[PDB]
Design a protein around this ligand. Structure first.
Ligand SMILES: Nc1ncnc2c1ncn2[C@@H]1O[C@H](COP(=O)(O)OP(=O)(O)OP(O)(O)=S)[C@@H](O)[C@H]1O
Ligand SMILES: [Mg+2]
Length: 163
DNA sequence: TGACTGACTGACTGACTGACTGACTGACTGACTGACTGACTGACTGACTGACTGACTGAC
């Protein structure tokens, strides 16, 4: 079809979703839509996870392109706040800034959302203790035994990456 | 039935780390660097040596 929807991928239900490359397949907007559908039909909070703090413009770069595809429901963009049908459930999450994470109470999020996972020829100033950072986040949110999933996508097929 | 608001707020900067790149270099080393005891034996030598001269008798 045109834009594959990842439900068949989600069928296996392992938490780690290693999707690689796929420039322009619509995994970006599928992983935008999916938590919105989950919050609408069940009531699960969602958090758009990036790596750094300085990006604030992603108030509108995440949510506009997927706002219209929903036919008959209401959406509100309030900066770091995301509202679906007048219910506040979405916020941006920086990884470089970890400390604000350790103060913030965890919203109940079924699946963490993340594409552009790989760094291609960056300045190499990524997050130190990177795999340890992801482990610390996973322990931090849902310290109970309730299961939590994660979706992570890389721009290009880098066969080996730190995780 | 309302009119600034005082404390949350987008944001939009204002100062600062390291990572990576752009030449030194002085550190390090290797390929000369011309000497310097050894070989040794090419040339040199006294040390050591075996057969011709030297004739009054064996013989007369
Ligand atoms: N719900 C949707 N409604 C409309 N178009 C969609 C939807 N989901 C995906 N797409 C399409 O998906 C295409 C690819 O856009 P992205 O979602 O950014 O792809 P992407 O797969 O994240 O690329 P990568 O892998 O991150 S480099 C766009 O042209 C959209 O039209
Ligand atoms: Mg993407």
């Amino acid at each position: 079809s045109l834009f594959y929807n990842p439900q068949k991928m989600l069928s296996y239900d392992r938490i780690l979703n290693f999707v690689i490359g796929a420039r322009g397949i619509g995994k970006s907007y599928a992983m935008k839509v999916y938590p919105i559908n989950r919050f609408i039909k069940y009531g699960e909070q969602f958090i758009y996870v990036r790596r750094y703090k300085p990006e604030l413009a992603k108030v509108s770069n995440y949510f506009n392109d997927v706002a219209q595809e929903f036919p008959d429901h209401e959406l509100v963009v309030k900066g770091r706040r995301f509202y679906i049908d007048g219910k506040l459930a979405g916020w941006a999450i920086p990884l470089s800034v970890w400390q604000s994470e350790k103060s913030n109470a965890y919203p109940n999020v079924s699946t963490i959302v993340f594409d552009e996972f790989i760094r291609e020829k960056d300045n190499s100033n990524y997050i130190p203790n990177e795999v340890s950072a992801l482990l610390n986040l996973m322990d931090t949110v849902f310290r109970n035994r309730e299961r939590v999933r994660c979706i992570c996508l890389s721009n290009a097929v880098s066969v080996v990456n730190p995780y």
